[PDB]
């Protein structure tokens, strides 16, 4: 099968500035009729993909002229002359020359902004959950930039991974930040066997990891 | 006004099957192929196959050939996809598309052993600064969706409601709200959660811990 490789995985764009993304094909895409069926699709998260460009350089219906496509042999490029807000989203290249048809892995255009450190908040189990026999500890890591972050849980200083459920927001449309929720779920009796509960965040905005902790017996 | 309208979300037990519809309008149905594409959660796009509505000719990606049957009904301008013998690998949004130039809105398939299960809703108060973050934990429900608001929608800024995550055949969702210390606990802050599938609607007030 043809494999399409897209770069970069993520592009931090700025309104009014040009953007360029690339799609490498594992083999030539010239069909026997002389046409090259390399297409581009744009998908805004939660929405359906739109037909942006076909046959390397032919604009899809209703697509604005700020988009242009080029390439030959195995390397193809999609350019935006000046990025506008509606251009954020995921762009997939696609080949229809060979069966099975295949898509690249996607390049996500996200909005560049200044780095921002997370606001980190830790929450012990609620009394209601404890009554039912469970104990979830929640950590929110809110309004940070860029999107890459790592969270580690520790119990009495020892790392715990079993029972962790993480969720991440998409980029906020208004402040361009990212947020994360991490929930460590234990039983109440397991929870009562230990004292200190820590959520530890590593993010490029902090020299050393950020630590939020509480002691159960306090 | 080209439109491809797809049928609603489907819940399938492991080992079972699903048939979904793609209702076309606004163009001559027999002048375009209908393609189908899969998008697994958090992943990219995979091409499944196409059908030509004039004569029912099909082309399948070999990877999908054993599990997938594409059909169409010219008289109703509707294409169908049946998926058989599913596992959680098949949980995804499935799109139909008119010659790839116009795509339906997608049909979600969730392959799970779960039955309808109401959530537990827990208020998260701070540990026993001028900014205060409160939370709400919505644990152990099926299927999607839940709705979550704060103070019946009157607390709308400073809210982060996180995408639900399916783990061990139940969903968990959470939400945080951030307010000034001069507003809480001096004012009431309540998380409102509805789960239509279980006809559940609950309000949990955030109370200072003791």
């Amino acid at each position: 099968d043809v494999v399409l490789t897209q770069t970069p995985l993520s592009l931090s764009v700025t309104i009014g500035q040009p953007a360029s993304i690339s799609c490498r094909s594992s083999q030539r895409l010239l069909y026997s009729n002389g046409k090259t069926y390399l297409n581009w699709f744009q998908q805004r998260p939660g929405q359906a993909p739109k037909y942006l460009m076909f046959q390397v350089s032919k604009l899809g219906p209703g697509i604005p002229a700020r988009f242009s496509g080029s390439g030959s042999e195995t390397d193809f490029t999609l350019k935006i002359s000046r990025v506008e807000a509606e251009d954020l989203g995921v762009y997939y290249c696609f080949q229809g020359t060979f069966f099975p048809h295949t898509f690249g892995g996607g390049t996500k255009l996200e909005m560049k902004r200044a780095d921002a450190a997370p606001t980190v908040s830790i929450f012990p189990p609620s009394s209601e959950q404890l009554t039912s026999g469970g104990a979830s500890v929640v950590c929110f890591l809110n309004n940070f930039y860029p999107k890459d972050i790592n969270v580690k849980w520790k119990i009495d200083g020892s790392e715990r991974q079993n029972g962790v459920l993480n969720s991440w927001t998409d980029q906020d449309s208004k402040d361009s930040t990212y947020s994360m929720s991490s929930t460590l779920t234990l039983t109440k009796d397991e929870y009562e066997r230990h004292n200190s509960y820590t959520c530890e965040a590593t993010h490029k905005t902090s020299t050393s990891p950020i630590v939020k902790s509480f002691n159960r017996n306090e | 006004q080209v439109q491809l309208r797809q049928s609603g979300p489907e819940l399938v037990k492991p080992g079972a099957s699903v048939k979904m519809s793609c209702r076309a309008s606004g163009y001559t149905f027999t002048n375009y192929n209908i393609h189908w594409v899969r998008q697994r959660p958090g992943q990219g796009l995979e091409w499944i196959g196409w059908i030509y509505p004039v004569d029912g000719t099909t082309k399948y990606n070999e990877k999908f050939k054993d599990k997938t049957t594409l059909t169409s009904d010219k008289s109703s301008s509707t294409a169908y996809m049946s998926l058989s013998g599913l596992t959680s690998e098949d949980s995804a949004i499935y799109f139909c598309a008119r010659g790839l130039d116009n795509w339906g809105q997608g049909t979600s398939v969730t392959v799970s052993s779960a039955k309808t299960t109401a959530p537990s809703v827990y208020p998260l108060a701070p540990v026993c600064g001028s900014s205060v973050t409160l939370g709400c934990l919505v644990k152990g429900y099926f299927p999607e969706p839940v709705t979550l608001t704060w103070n019946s929608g009157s607390l709308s800024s400073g809210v982060h409601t996180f995408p639900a995550v399916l783990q061990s055949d139940l969903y968990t969702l959470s939400s945080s709200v951030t307010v000034t210390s001069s507003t809480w606990p001096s004012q009431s802050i309540t998380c409102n959660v509805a789960h239509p599938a279980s006809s559940t609607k609950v309000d949990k007030k955030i109370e200072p811990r003791g």
Partner: peptide, 9 residues
């Protein structure tokens, strides 16, 4: 056709 693939062209 739509131009997207040979079968769509």
């Amino acid at each position: 056709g739509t131009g997207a693939t040979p079968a769509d062209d």
